[PDB]
Structure 1
Amino acid sequence: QKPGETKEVHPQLTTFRCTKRGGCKPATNFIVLDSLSHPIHRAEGLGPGGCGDWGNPPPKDVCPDVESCAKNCIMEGIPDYSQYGVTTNGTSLRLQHILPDGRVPSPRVYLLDKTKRRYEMLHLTGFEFTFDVDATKLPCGMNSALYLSEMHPTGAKSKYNPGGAYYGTGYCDAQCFVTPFINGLGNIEGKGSCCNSMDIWEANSRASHVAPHTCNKKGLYLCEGEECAFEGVCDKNGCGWNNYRVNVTDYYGRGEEFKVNTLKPFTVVTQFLANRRGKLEKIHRFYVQDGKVIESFYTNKEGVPYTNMIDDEFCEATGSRKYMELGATQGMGEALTRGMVLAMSIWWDQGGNMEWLDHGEAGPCAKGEGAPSNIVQVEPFPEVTYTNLRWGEIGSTY
């Protein structure tokens, strides 16, 4: 959409780059909200209205084609991110799902490089990503996410999309959702926005989930028809890793009875271990809390391969069929090697109550407990803070 007259003022965030040799050294990065989370409105004389709702093509009256859409729909800068529940303090990024005044901004943001015109492209195959988190205000049904998508580095900046990454354009993930704009261009044909994504962290105070999601395309792929569906080009389910799902129930939770105690801050390490040919083999998640390394659990379930890391053997046996079919662990790793964008978000789920994350087979949460109507009766103001985001040499971030 066309950038408007209001200026964009991105939050600055200090992150780190790590080596065994020099340790963690500070870096400047900026934060940007999703393009379609910016105010979008019609050009002067075209009246009231936006330019389409999530899940739809843009309106045919203002967006009969890409060129018209580029002129007729205006995207405004955000001069004050705190209005969207987004703030930074030094190395800390706070995402508020609900504001005191009742607004539910449910922010999703990306990491911009220091120039503010390209996303910071992380290449994590053979490397580790680490961050500190405070999950105390995330009850059942809430999802703090920190994850990677193979978005285009300039947000596919182009003639009709001049805003680019500076305005948060170019979002995609393994779900192939239809958005009214894709790569900053009117989605006239109503395609889905598909790409490989590595869900490093989808979690609340009750459960913690890690999942690669493969697509059989490189980059952002606009899918049509069945390509967007379950047997299509992306892995909607991902290869899910969650202690509760492998019959370990005392690893992560609210209280001293859990190895990771989500009433207190902790550190989340994710290692992307590559084989002798440089291909991704295994994904290893452990934690650190009160200065103690908390090692990954091992699986403990009849019919589930014995392992303490995600790999092809586990994924296959736990029925991650499209993950294997669409390129398996090696395929995830090719994406990561090409370069990925970091996204961080806080959301909830009106349709399904985030049950896949923390209910039944996946956690201690009751039926109904994660509905949005119940969340606000448990924690009125859900929020998460990620701090000291840092990546680099295996063994160097903690």
Structure 2
Amino acid sequence: QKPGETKEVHPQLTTFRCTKRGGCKPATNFIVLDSLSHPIHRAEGLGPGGCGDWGNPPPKDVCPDVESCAKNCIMEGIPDYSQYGVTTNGTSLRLQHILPDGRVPSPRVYLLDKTKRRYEMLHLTGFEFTFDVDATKLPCGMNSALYLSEMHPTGAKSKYNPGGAYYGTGYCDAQCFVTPFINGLGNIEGKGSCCNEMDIWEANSRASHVAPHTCNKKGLYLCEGEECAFEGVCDKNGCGWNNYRVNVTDYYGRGEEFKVNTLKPFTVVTQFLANRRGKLEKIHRFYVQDGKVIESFYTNKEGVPYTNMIDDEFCEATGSRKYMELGATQGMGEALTRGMVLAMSIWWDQGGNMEWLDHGEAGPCAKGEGAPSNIVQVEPFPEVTYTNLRWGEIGSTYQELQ
């Protein structure tokens, strides 16, 4: 959609680049809300209304074709990101799901480079990504997410999408959802927006999940029909890694009973380990809390290979069929090598209560406990803070107390 007159005021976020010899060096980045979370209205003279709802093509009165949609639908800048639950402070990013005014902005943001006009493209195969988190205000059913999508670096800036990454255009993920704009262009045919997705972190104070999701496509693919469905071009489920799913129940949770005690802040380290041919072979997650490294658990379950890292043998054995068919760990790594955009979000699930994250096989949350209607009794204002985003050489992003 066409940018409007209102100023976009991106929050500034200091991050780090790390090497063993040089330590962690600060860098300037900016934060941008998803394009379709900006106010979208019709051009002057065309009356009231927007330009479409999630899940659908844009309305054909203003968007009969891409060219018309591009002139007839206007996307306003956001001058105060706090109105959407997004604030920064130094090296910290705070995402508020619910505001005191009662709004539920459920923000999703991307990391922009220092120019504000191109996403910060991360190339993580053979490297590590680390962040600090405060998960205390995330009960059952909440998902704080920090993940990578194979979005285009400029948000696919083009004649009809002049806003680009500066306005957060170009979102895609492994769910192939239909949005009224894709790559900043009106989605006349109602295609889904598909791409490879590495879910570094999907977690609350009750469970922590990691999952690569492959697609058989490079970059953003517009899917039709069955291509967007479970048997299509992307892996909806992912290859999931959650201590509870592998019968380790004392690793992560609220209290001293857990190794990673989510009542306190902690550091989350993710290494993307390559083989000698430079292809991704293993994904390794460990933590740091109270100045001490917390190594990964090993799996502890019948039928699950004994491992402390995600790899093809584990993914296959645990039933990650589309993951394997659509490229497996090597395919995920090829996307990481090409370059990915960092997305951070907070959300809840009216339909399914986030049960896959923290209920049953996946955690301690009871049936119904993660419903949004229950979340608000437990934590009226869910929120997450990510701090000290940093990436670089294996072994360089963390430091134990001496």
Give yes or no for TM over 0.5. yes
Structure 2 CA distance, aligned partners of 1:62 and 1:368?
A: 42
* CA offset digits 1:154-204 (Å, max 9, x no partner): 000000000000000000000000000000000000000000000000000
Structure 1: 5+ residue runs without aligned partners? none
Q: How far 1:12 sits from its partner (Å)?
A: 0.3
* CA offset digits 1:270-308 (Å, max 9, x no partner): 000000000000000000000010000000000000000
Give secondary structure in 1 for the equivalent of 2:336. Answer: helix
Q: How far 1:238 sits from its partner (Å)?
A: 0.3
Q: How far 1:372 sits from its partner (Å)?
A: 0.4
Structure 2: 5+ residue runs without aligned partners? none
Q: How far 1:261 sits from its partner (Å)?
A: 0.2
Structure 1 CA distance, aligned partners of 2:371 and 2:302?
A: 31
| 43-52 or 383-392: bigger deviation | 43-52
Structure 1 CA distance, aligned partners of 2:380 and 2:39?
A: 25
Structure 2 CA distance, aligned partners of 1:284 and 1:102?
A: 39
* CA offset digits 1:98-133 (Å, max 9, x no partner): 001101000000000000000000000000000000
* CA offset digits 1:222-249 (Å, max 9, x no partner): 0101100001000000000000000000
Structure 1 CA distance, aligned partners of 2:297 and 2:195?
A: 30
Aligned pairs for 1:165-176 within 5 A: 165-176=165-176
Structure 1 CA distance, aligned partners of 2:129 and 2:40?
A: 34
Q: How far 1:149 sits from its partner (Å)?
A: 0.3
Structure 2 CA distance, aligned partners of 1:60 and 1:306?
A: 55
Counterpart of 1:191 in structure 2 is: 191
Structure 1 CA distance, aligned partners of 2:283 and 2:291?
A: 22
Structure 1 CA distance, aligned partners of 2:377 and 2:39?
A: 29
Structure 2 CA distance, aligned partners of 1:220 and 1:302?
A: 38
Structure 1 CA distance, aligned partners of 2:237 and 2:373?
A: 26
- CA RMSD after TM alignment: 0.3
Give secondary structure in 2 for the equivalent of 1:287. Answer: strand
Structure 1 CA distance, aligned partners of 2:372 and 2:41?
A: 28
Counterpart of 2:283 in structure 1 is: 283
Structure 2 CA distance, aligned partners of 1:42 and 1:190?
A: 20
Structure 2 CA distance, aligned partners of 1:101 and 1:377?
A: 17
Q: How far 1:147 sits from its partner (Å)?
A: 0.1
* CA offset digits 1:50-80 (Å, max 9, x no partner): 1010000000111000000001100000000
Give secondary structure in 1 for the equivalent of 2:178. Answer: coil
Q: How far 1:394 sits from its partner (Å)?
A: 0.1
Structure 1 CA distance, aligned partners of 2:53 and 2:201?
A: 27
Structure 1 CA distance, aligned partners of 2:123 and 2:156?
A: 19
* CA offset digits 1:252-271 (Å, max 9, x no partner): 00000000000000000000
Structure 2 CA distance, aligned partners of 1:38 and 1:323?
A: 33
Structure 2 CA distance, aligned partners of 1:60 and 1:352?
A: 32
Counterpart of 1:130 in structure 2 is: 130
If the length of structure 1 is used for normalisation, what is the TM-score?
1.00
Q: How far 1:48 sits from its partner (Å)?
A: 1.2
Structure 1 CA distance, aligned partners of 2:3 and 2:229?
A: 33
Structure 2 CA distance, aligned partners of 1:249 and 1:122?
A: 33
Counterpart of 1:143 in structure 2 is: 143
If the length of structure 2 is used for normalisation, what is the TM-score?
0.99
Moved over 3 A (4+): none
Verify: 1:180 aligned to 2:180, yes or no: yes
Give secondary structure in 2 for the equivalent of 1:15. Answer: strand
Q: How far 1:47 sits from its partner (Å)?
A: 1.2
Give secondary structure in 1 for the equivalent of 2:378. Answer: coil
Structure 1 CA distance, aligned partners of 2:260 and 2:253?
A: 6
* CA offset digits 1:124-143 (Å, max 9, x no partner): 00000000000000000000
Counterpart of 1:232 in structure 2 is: 232
Residues paired across the two proteins, number: 398
Q: How far 1:46 sits from its partner (Å)?
A: 1.3
Q: How far 1:215 sits from its partner (Å)?
A: 0.2
Give secondary structure in 1 for the equivalent of 2:357. Answer: helix
Structure 1 CA distance, aligned partners of 2:87 and 2:230?
A: 36
* CA offset digits 1:2-61 (Å, max 9, x no partner): 000001000000000000010100000000000000000011121111101000000011
